Structure to design on (1372 residues):
């Protein structure tokens, strides 16, 4: 019977923000207050230009901002007034100690939990939205039960997020499903039903799926595991195609017409990237090693190993094709973002293709149309960067007097280039290693030009 | 030109149904299925077909005697037919080099050589049999080594995608038909000619033409992807039992992401059937042939997971019976590898039954459609005489037993009288549900006094 | 056409002697030996050459400025030459993919590209560097791209220290080339150069790959022998047999030969280990792990032999060597050279340095700056002294460690050495140079331990 009147969200990031903006927009009589430790980020949200850009987000925020939606920096009063409290802070991979470089660090989630119980009174619904390790909600509950008061009654729910970077507003206005996890006790289900009620304001009851708490946490990770698996699986197929004279695009199409298999996430590449997949896989493999599930640990670890194989063997072909040495040779790196049409570099296959060539002493010239040059120096640093790396300002400068052109990001502009011009002003034999299949179709015109072309999944 | 006479060498789970469906759809084409096995051809020409397949008996009776024939006269059949299917079995080698891993092609080769010994003029030889990549090239060399004047034999790949239990449905309305052929003129003659046969009931949009190697590899990749889904959901199942999450919940949340799909996410004791294990093992072995050890161990994980799923389940039964099962009666419900078939090939029931037989148990096995003599054959290799009993009905098997092990998801098992089953079971009585069919009946079952444990649910 | 002008890119231990010997034999041919190291070139034009090779000083001074030249000007040497030798180094890559295994072909690639940037008309490019199999296909692809040049293989078989005798009286010459018309003309042209002083029966012609691979295979067999007889020495030590008797016995069987059966602390030198590693790394790419791990045993045994010997010393010195003066007699990798590439002396010294031993190192032909360089990367200032004469090195020494078979180490006065060593005294004979001299040393009071004696 509980009705959720005011909402607070700790963490105004890529998840915290748009999620609450849409809630605000869909349920005009609910107050949505987004707070965050980073005072700048909060300010950019009330600013004309948003901290994170998502198509349609500005329209949504500007619709209810100041009406029922508020961005604020006063976290404490947001919490003590709220009915439901989202925890949407980050869980970065631990950089030291046990689980170094795989395990998730809960220090921020724990900070939200302690600050909540500090400022809370009466009844409240705490809902974690961050990708957490299974039973991380058990920690939030430990903390709350340890620091209890009279009339304090805090209920912990899981409500993970699923939006893809790029389609967030669509993916939230019209979700494939909404996921809510709660205790299978009466205090839980009441809290589950309260969060349902909020999602019912624009999400049909049929797409709202309720589970237990650990099913919901585990669901978040596994969805990413299955997706990343699909890519590693087709990538391994692409290796096999090159050895047997098959074409991986032909094999993809045939596989994906099996409706039980489906056709999404089958485009073989030089490796997947992004701030989410590899992190979640490592998180799950570390969790498994801690629950004495080595069989399961090493099952999922093959998603990473294969993705690491895909990248390393690309670099190997380049060196193997360049007469086994690539030291002091100019090489063009076309594309630095992990996927096209973005400026995000996180875990981009190009960082590692570049780092491999940099270990040989190749003189790299890098071009991305959207990535700032100073970001590329960070991703390659940690200098060896000054001697070998050079961020070019247009593609043709990168290919001038180069041995090879390496395409590492699927930018559509790379499909349009003047490979006539590039060839005259390259060293011979000129090579093209395309690791994003963007040059599919153009293979014949390129050979006759004299270009030597090697692409993933075709001999 | 038109194919007017088809011959299919191999009257098994592929050759029978696929040919019945062609005849039923192509009245003007004479379809003859041949086999070296006379009892089987006898069964085909009888009111009791040699396999149980929903709907197969109507389709056969629909045109048997008119354009559909079953004979042991292989030689005259090859001679008469325009198109010759190769649809013989391709088991894993149980001996020699690659024992336990490599595919055994002795049955393909015998077809190829019989085909050439029986052939004049023009024929299209098509292999449906799942084979290693480059396997048609062998048939092609055998034909080239034994060409006689006017002998023109074209070779095609036409992998089959039906699933047992849904064969007539899959054949009558396939997601796709895949044909692999020479990029040469004679090959395109051959491929167009086979497209014409399927174009009688299969829309041209759903007919995929590729080269021979892509076709064979697609069939392999399709099966690998499917089996991977099962191993992936099963690996999640083990993690569920350790965390308290529920695999049926997690599966559901995962499958509503349309990029993943909701098919083939039903955790089990282990996938069976003639093809998944052997096809993975084939691809893995072939990867070693071609210096691709990374790919080999990426897919090897599919089998290892499945074998761990099975061992872990056997272990629950034994650990929950205090690690001693000697002379304890155990009911085994379901011996078929899936429901709606009589095929037991590689059924998890076999491996589960064998684990319990090694512990000295008294197994009473029931299954609605698997013939009695097949079960005895599958557990022999007597241990069977001392330990194994085939039960006429499920209540007999559960009578005086310590536990019920459900291995096949036949619908009837959910409908049993467990009230009755309990009174005559030894106490404490266990139901180990290896297929999640008793889901939602757990509360009722516990009050009846039954102890129920199922894949992917924390005890 | 008769080859009238020859260029050799790379004036090292191969390009220098091999071209000196070509010039001394062929007075109607102009041989210019070039290199980027200007100090190396200048030393080749000096009364003190940049390498110690017996007979080499005579040969060079007999032609330098008649038909033998050493220049920094790489381009004109190629432009005007009829034949360009590539004799540059192919080390083991210390970086990137295959670090510690694969051969670095960056110096070959440099020649191939400078040749075509600096040459017109007809020229013969010969690969004398020890390359992997099919590396001559790579130079061919380069030349057929930036387009008339022919590519040949002519590996060298000279061993350092005997380079002059081996170049004047070779067992055989190996020339590998294309099986084409254009190729077989270029091969018989190089034969003509060698036929001035090598008989035709001892000139062997094959194809490019068979030649590139014969060089590696030959060095494998050679290195395998040493390791093989070295393994027997450890067998001898445990059964009281004697490695020299066993070796002598083995070698009387004509089918085995009597050569390369001298046990030792471990084979060194620029090539064996890198060539074995090269071939192993070749084998992985070719999906041949048995061949790979077969030849890998040639390296493991070598490393074992050195370690076993280094531990011999530490164990015998009552298990501790910290702050103890030890003499290292012999830093070159073999006798009659000053090359210290992969000398076992480096590996024993580095082992002894890890124990904190103060080393005093002597070698007749190795210059002191090389030893300091070889033993570093300070730890060296603290622990390593370089002695002007041997008796200085052994003054107050706990032990004398012989790592090189310089004939003069017999000639020493171990009466005198023993009087001024700390007690008890030890000699560790890593080359068996002291056989027969034992009883003397035993009576003098020296404790003598060598390779292959219990
Ligand atoms: N990036 C994505 O596409 C998705 C991310 N996620 C989850 O979101 C996490 C990070 O989310 P983002 O919004 O992308 O990152 P973010 O770092 O932009 O957002 C988290 C915000 O929380 C603030 N914060 C951290 N600790 C705090 C504390 N104790 N008190 C107050 N504010 C605090 C941070 O300053 C930051 O602005 C991931 O690790 C994952 O768990 C889930 C789905 C997708
Ligand atoms: N059973 C299935 O679900 C499917 C299997 N496949 C593939 O189709 C092939 C056939 O499989 P099944 O029909 O299940 O096997 P099966 O063993 O039931 O049928 C093969 C038939 O071929 C006959 N045969 C063997 N050698 C012969 C010869 N030299 N001459 C004449 N007849 C001969 C056998 O007696 C047998 O009746 C396999 O390669 C399998 O991988 C493809 C799709 C579905
Ligand atoms: N040392 C030996 O006994 C033999 C060695 N070989 C092979 O012959 C080769 C020559 O080895 P070494 O002479 O001992 O080594 P090295 O290091 O003495 O000679 C290489 C010389 O070439 C110069 N060089 C390298 N790249 C150059 C370039 N691009 N342009 C101009 N000069 C360049 C270097 O400055 C150096 O002085 C090696 O590949 C070796 O494996 C073959 C037979 C015998
Ligand atoms: O066919 C394909 C599709 C994608 N990719 C690669 O996959 C990577 C990841 O792309 P994407 O899925 O957009 O990553 P994210 O933007 O981080 O979003 C993922 O991670 C989020 C956080 O868990 C989930 O909400 C999303 O559903 C999931 O797509 C990229 O580098 C792509 O190049 C391929 O290689 N082939
Ligand atoms: O979610 C699932 C789906 C299946 N299974 C099991 O997996 C096995 C295989 O199931 P299914 O695919 O229906 O069996 P098959 O009849 O062997 O069909 C597969 O193998 C055929 C032979 O290659 C292909 O033609 C089909 O496309 C492919 O589905 C059976 O033991 C099932 O019980 C599960 O455990 N969970
Ligand atoms: O019976 C023996 C023979 C040699 N060695 C050791 O082997 C090493 C190398 O000796 P050697 O073969 O002379 O070395 P190199 O001077 O490098 O010559 C070898 O390596 C050259 C480069 O590949 C080839 O040209 C020669 O044919 C080949 O003998 C030295 O450290 C020696 O002490 C022994 O220990 N015992």
């Amino acid at each position: 019977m509980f009705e959720i009147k005011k909402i607070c969200c700790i963490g105004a990031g890529y998840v915290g923000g748009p999620t609450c903006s849409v809630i605000a927009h869909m349920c005009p009589e609910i107050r949505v207050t987004v707070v965050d430790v980073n005072e700048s980020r909060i300010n950019a949200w009330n600013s004309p230009t948003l901290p994170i850009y998502e198509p349609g987000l500005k329209e949504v925020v500007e619709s209810c901002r100041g009406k029922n939606l508020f961005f604020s920096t006063n976290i404490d009063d947001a919490i003590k007034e709220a009915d439901l409290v989202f925890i949407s802070v980050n869980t970065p991979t631990k950089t030291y100690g046990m689980g170094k470089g795989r395990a998730a660090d809960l220090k921020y989630i724990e900070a939200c939990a302690r600050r909540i119980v500090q400022n809370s009174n009466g009844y409240k619904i705490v809902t974690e939205k961050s990708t957490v390790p299974v039973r991380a909600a058990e920690s939030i509950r430990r903390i709350f039960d340890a620091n209890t008061k009279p009339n304090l009654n805090l209920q912990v729910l899981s409500n993970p997020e699923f939006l893809a970077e790029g389609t967030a507003i669509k993916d939230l206005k019209n979700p494939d499903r909404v996921l809510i996890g709660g205790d299978e006790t009466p205090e839980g289900q009441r809290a589950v039903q309260a969060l349902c009620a909020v999602y019912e304001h624009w999400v049909p009851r049929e797409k709202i799926l309720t589970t237990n708490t650990w099913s919901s946490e585990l669901s978040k990770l596994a969805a990413n595991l299955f997706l990343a698996q699909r890519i590693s699986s087709i990538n391994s197929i692409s290796a096999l195609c090159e050895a047997t004279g098959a074409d991986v695009e032909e094999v993809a199409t045939a596989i994906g017409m099996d409706q039980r298999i489906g056709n999404k996430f089958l485009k073989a590449s030089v490796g997947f990237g992004g701030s989410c997949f590899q992190k979640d896989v490592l998180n799950l493999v570390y969790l498994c090693e801690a629950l004495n599930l080595p069989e399961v640990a090493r099952y999922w670890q093959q998603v990473i190993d294969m993705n690491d194989y895909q990248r390393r063997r690309f670099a190997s072909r380049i060196i193997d094709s360049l007469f086994n040495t690539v030291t002091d040779k100019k090489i063009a790196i076309l594309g630095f973002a992990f996927k096209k049409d973005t400026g995000d570099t996180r875990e981009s296959s190009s960082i590692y293709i570049s780092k491999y060539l940099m270990d040989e002493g190749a003189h790299l010239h890098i071009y991305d149309p959207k990535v700032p040059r100073e970001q590329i120096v960070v991703d390659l640093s940690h200098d060896q960067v000054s001697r070998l790396v050079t961020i070019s300002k247009d593609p043709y400068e990168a290919c001038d007097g180069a041995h090879a052109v390496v395409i590492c990001t699927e930018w559509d502009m790379f499909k349009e280039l003047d490979y006539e011009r590039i060839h005259k002003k390259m060293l011979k034999p000129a090579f093209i290693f395309d690791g994003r299949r963007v040059l599919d179709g153009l293979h014949n015109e390129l050979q006759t030009i004299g270009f030597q072309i090697e692409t993933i999944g075709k001999k």
Remarks:
- The longest strand of chain A covers residues 123-128.
- The radius of gyration of chain A is 25 Å.
- The longest helix of chain A spans residues 213-244.
- The CA atoms of residues 206 and 276 of chain A lie 28 Å apart.
